[PDB]
Design a protein around this nucleic acid. Structure first.
Ligand SMILES: [Mg+2]
Ligand SMILES: [Mg+2]
Ligand SMILES: [Mg+2]
Ligand SMILES: [Mg+2]
Ligand SMILES: [Mg+2]
Ligand SMILES: [Mg+2]
Ligand SMILES: [Mg+2]
Ligand SMILES: [Mg+2]
Ligand SMILES: [Mg+2]
Ligand SMILES: [Mg+2]
Ligand SMILES: [Mg+2]
Ligand SMILES: [Mg+2]
Ligand SMILES: [Mg+2]
Ligand SMILES: [Mg+2]
Ligand SMILES: [Mg+2]
Ligand SMILES: [Mg+2]
Ligand SMILES: [Mg+2]
Ligand SMILES: [Mg+2]
Ligand SMILES: [Mg+2]
Ligand SMILES: [Mg+2]
Ligand SMILES: [Mg+2]
Ligand SMILES: [Mg+2]
Ligand SMILES: [Mg+2]
Ligand SMILES: [Mg+2]
Ligand SMILES: [Mg+2]
Ligand SMILES: [Zn+2]
Lengths: 123, 112, 93, 43, 53
RNA sequence: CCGAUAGUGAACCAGUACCGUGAGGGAAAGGUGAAAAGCACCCCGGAAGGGGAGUGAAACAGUUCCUGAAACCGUGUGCCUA
RNA sequence: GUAUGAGUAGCGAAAGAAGGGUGAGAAUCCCUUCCACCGAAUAUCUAAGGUUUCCUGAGGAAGGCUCGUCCGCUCAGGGUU
């Protein structure tokens, strides 16, 4: 039955796209409990799409990844984007691993509002 | 002689009813366990009580030469202090009172 | 009245010190003194040749030192520029 | 929705000012009474 | 929708008998040697399951 | 005759603060100690605030500071109570 | 002056997320990227009115319906030709 996160349908999809892309780029982010428990599934499905490695799969993933620059390489300055990293770095790492590309580690309550914070990373 | 020591924090901006709900957890317990309890209780009165407790332990060790490992919390209570009177504008041109309350926190440690 | 009466004291700040290099000198003058009187007070005190004078009127600031409220003195600031061929006013020695 | 006090300097000085008080017998009576009570501000 | 009679002290305390808050569920990290929350990453030695993170 | 809710509205920077467009209305607020000798120095804390040490006749007189009642808020315990 | 109602109503239209920094302490302060809102205005001038609220350096008692290392708040200096 998935999970509404205190925000409307269009707002919820925008939040999920932001966190999923932030996890691909930095590979280790700190969020609340339910929010991480929700982005887990979308990141893992996205990594499966990267595992497929097709052009159709690339378009499917591109309909979800935010268009932002990970870092710039001197090939001549040419930036690399999040989709390129997903299909060139992250996906080949787990070629031999079937499922479970993420883990969740609990931290403790936030000071301002007592929210239970966790750290979610892709290993 | 002088087997106990105490520390007081006077006129702390925290309502007494909100500190007398955390200070009831650490009464009659070891100082290590009490510090651990105050560390993992996510209320707003925990840091203040923890600071007072550590000050009491410090001046028990320094002035009176007792052992940290052999201390328990005998007494701990919260007493009232002066209140600041403020107002909040309600509807139809009338205001209602607001009480910003303070409190006095006291903790006493001693040998078992 | 007397030339030394309508010129009170120099103004020593960061802005005035900055503009001293441009032959501009900032002074404090009487509140009833027109800029012509200022131009004739200076040049008579310092023996220079004034080119132009600008004046500025400042209000009093509301101060407080505990239950007591009041205003500082109102000022009248003047900037005097000497001509290129005149001498220079020393200010700080 | 607009309220009863719409401020203006000139109107205040023309209606409640010192010269307006001093221009009338009864204004001078008001000024004398305010002086008698010892008030800090006249008019 | 307004109190008919004021509440005594006995009844007030009787109602407040349940307004306490519970004790945390903590024990001691094997590596740290001091207290931490179960199923949580201890903040002193920065380790969980005997592995640093 | 009064002795700080009294006696002038005002024992204190009072026709002040505040209220009103204006005429006008109009408060609250006294006391460390004989003498600042107003707490050097050490410890906990970012600080506030405390515990020692010292001055003092007294600090349970520590910059609303002589005395400190009642409501009201707590901590401990002898007897009783589902 | 202090209680009961009671840790109850309320916290005053609205989209945020993550990564760095500072700091005793960060959902709330600074920087970056992405996202979202207004656009005959939620943009740019200028009267009335207010009267220092403007700038820089310090600060966190009170004020800010939470927090605050921040501020139209406190302190000290400046600023209107
Ligand atoms: Mg839509
Ligand atoms: Mg009314
Ligand atoms: Mg109204
Ligand atoms: Mg001019
Ligand atoms: Mg003037
Ligand atoms: Mg003056
Ligand atoms: Mg008396
Ligand atoms: Mg009287
Ligand atoms: Mg007025
Ligand atoms: Mg005296
Ligand atoms: Mg001190
Ligand atoms: Mg002391
Ligand atoms: Mg002593
Ligand atoms: Mg003695
Ligand atoms: Mg006496
Ligand atoms: Mg007393
Ligand atoms: Mg009593
Ligand atoms: Mg109810
Ligand atoms: Mg309810
Ligand atoms: Mg709001
Ligand atoms: Mg951060
Ligand atoms: Mg739009
Ligand atoms: Mg500013
Ligand atoms: Mg606040
Ligand atoms: Mg300011
Ligand atoms: Zn550990």
């Amino acid at each position: 039955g998935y999970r509404k996160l205190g925000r409307t349908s269009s707002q919820r999809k925008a939040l999920l796209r932001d966190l999923a892309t932030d996890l691909i780029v930095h590979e280790r982010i700190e969020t609340t409990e339910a929010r991480a428990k929700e982005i887990r599934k979308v990141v893992e499905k996205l990594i499966t799409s990267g595992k497929k490695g097709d052009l159709h799969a690339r378009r499917q993933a591109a309909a979800f990844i935010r268009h932002e620059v990970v870092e710039v390489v001197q090939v001549k300055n040419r930036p690399v984007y999040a989709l390129q990293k997903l299909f060139d770095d992250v996906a080949p790492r787990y070629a031999e691993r079937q499922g479970g590309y993420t883990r969740i580690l609990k931290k403790g309550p936030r000071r301002g509002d007592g929210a239970p914070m966790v750290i979610i990373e892709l290993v | 002689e002088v087997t106990s020591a105490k520390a007081v924090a006077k006129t702390v901006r925290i309502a007494p009813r909100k500190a007398r709900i955390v200070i009831d957890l650490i009464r009659g317990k070891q100082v290590g366990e009490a510090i651990a309890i105050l560390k993992y209780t996510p209320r707003s009165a925990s840091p203040i009580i923890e600071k007072v407790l550590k000050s009491a332990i410090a001046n028990a060790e320094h002035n009176y030469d007792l052992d940290i490992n052999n201390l328990v919390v005998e007494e701990a209570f919260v007493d009232e202090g002066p209140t600041l009177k403020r107002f909040r504008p309600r509807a139809q041109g009338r205001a209602s009172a607001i009480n910003k309350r303070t409190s006095h926190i006291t903790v006493v440690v001693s040998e078992v | 009245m007397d030339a030394r009466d309508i010129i009170k004291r120099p103004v020593v700040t960061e802005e005035s010190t900055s503009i001293l290099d441009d032959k501009k000198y900032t002074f404090e003058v009487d509140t009833r003194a027109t800029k012509t009187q200022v131009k004739y007070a200076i040049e008579e005190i310092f023996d220079v040749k004034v080119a132009k004078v600008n004046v500025m009127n400042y209000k009093g600031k509301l101060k407080r030192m505990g239950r007591y409220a009041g205003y500082t003195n109102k000022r009248r600031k003047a900037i005097v520029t000497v001509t290129a061929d005149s001498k220079e006013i020393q200010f700080f020695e | 929705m607009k309220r009863t006090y719409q401020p203006s300097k000139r109107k205040r000085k023309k209606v409640h000012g010192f010269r307006t008080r001093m221009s009338t017998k009864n204004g001078r009576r008001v000024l004398a009474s305010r002086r008698r009570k010892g008030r800090k501000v006249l008019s | 929708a307004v109190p008919f009679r004021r509440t005594s002290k006995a009844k007030k305390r009787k109602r407040r008998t349940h307004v306490k808050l519970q004790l945390p569920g903590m024990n001691e990290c094997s590596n740290c040697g001091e207290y931490r929350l179960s199923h949580h990453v201890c903040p002193e030695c920065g380790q969980y399951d005997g592995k640093d993170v």
